Amino acid sequence: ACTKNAIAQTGFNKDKYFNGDVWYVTDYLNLQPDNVPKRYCAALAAGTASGKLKEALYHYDPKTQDTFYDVSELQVESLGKYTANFKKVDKNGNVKVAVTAGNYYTFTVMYADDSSALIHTCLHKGNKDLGDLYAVLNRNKDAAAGDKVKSAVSAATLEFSKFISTKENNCAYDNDSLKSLLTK
Numbered sequence: 001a002c003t004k005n006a007i008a009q010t011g012f013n014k015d016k017y018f019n020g021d022v023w024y025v026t027d028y029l030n031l032q033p034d035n036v037p038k039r040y041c042a043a044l045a046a047g048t049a050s051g052k053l054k055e056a057l058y059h060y061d062p063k064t065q066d067t068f069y070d071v072s073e074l075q076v077e078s079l080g081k082y083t084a085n086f087k088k089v090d091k092n093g094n095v096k097v098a099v100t101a102g103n104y105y106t107f108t109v110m111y112a113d114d115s116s117a118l119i120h121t122c123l124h125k126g127n128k129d130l131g132d133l134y135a136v137l138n139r140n141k142d143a144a145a146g147d148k149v150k151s152a153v154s155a156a157t158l159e160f161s162k163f164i165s166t167k168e169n170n171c172a173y174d175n176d177s178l179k180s181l182l183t184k
């Protein structure tokens with residue numbers, strides 16, 4: 001179930017978030033914890049291409065080896081709040097599963113600055129969803145969450161101590177593939 005209307009950041013700077021670069025997930029929290037694994041690697045690139053907001057996603061489960069990339073076109077609901085389609089692709093952008101009606105995620109940027117962000121997303125696949133997921137992002141894959149993003153976590157009535165870190169997984173990313181997916 002999707003249960004939260006996530007509040008976008010006051011003064012959100014869209015151009016700085018959607019600048020073409022990679023954001024690494026450093027910490028995450030699902031409100032239905034059994035919906036996601038306890039060990040995981042994820043990253044995204046976010047930018048504008050051909051006049052549209054785009055994200056490219058990467059997921060990797062280091063226990064099962066499941067690996068997948070996605071390309072998304074984001075439509076604007078309001079500043080910092082988006083509805084994204086998705087197509088599953090290989091690292092080279094070859095579509096494995098096309099954009100499909102009712103395959104979408106919502107995406108809200110709750111906080112962002114030059115180095116860090118806090119987002120909310122709820123994923124829909126037909127009549128099922130994967131629950132409310134929060135993620136702390138950083139421009140540096142290893143970086144400890146700083147005071148400002150932690151203040152944003154608390155101001156959303158969340159406890160940072162409940163987030164799961166991706167650090168122990170020593171994740172590695174294909175940054176060229178991921179960023180280049182923005183034009184796919």
Ligand code: HEM
Nearest residue numbers: 025028036037040041042059070086087088105121123135
């Ligand atoms: C550590 C962070 C994350 C974890 C642990 C996580 C976990 C998952 C898992 C377990 C699935 C497969 C669900 C299923 O097959 O039912 C999935 C798929 C997906 N995730 Fe997440 N995810 C994370 C971050 C994100 C972020 C930030 C976004 C969007 C910006 C996102 C968007 C999606 C989409 C669109 C799919 C479906 C992919 C497809 O079928 O093509 N994920 N992720």
Ligand SMILES: [N]
Nearest residue numbers: 121123130133
């Ligand atoms: N997700």
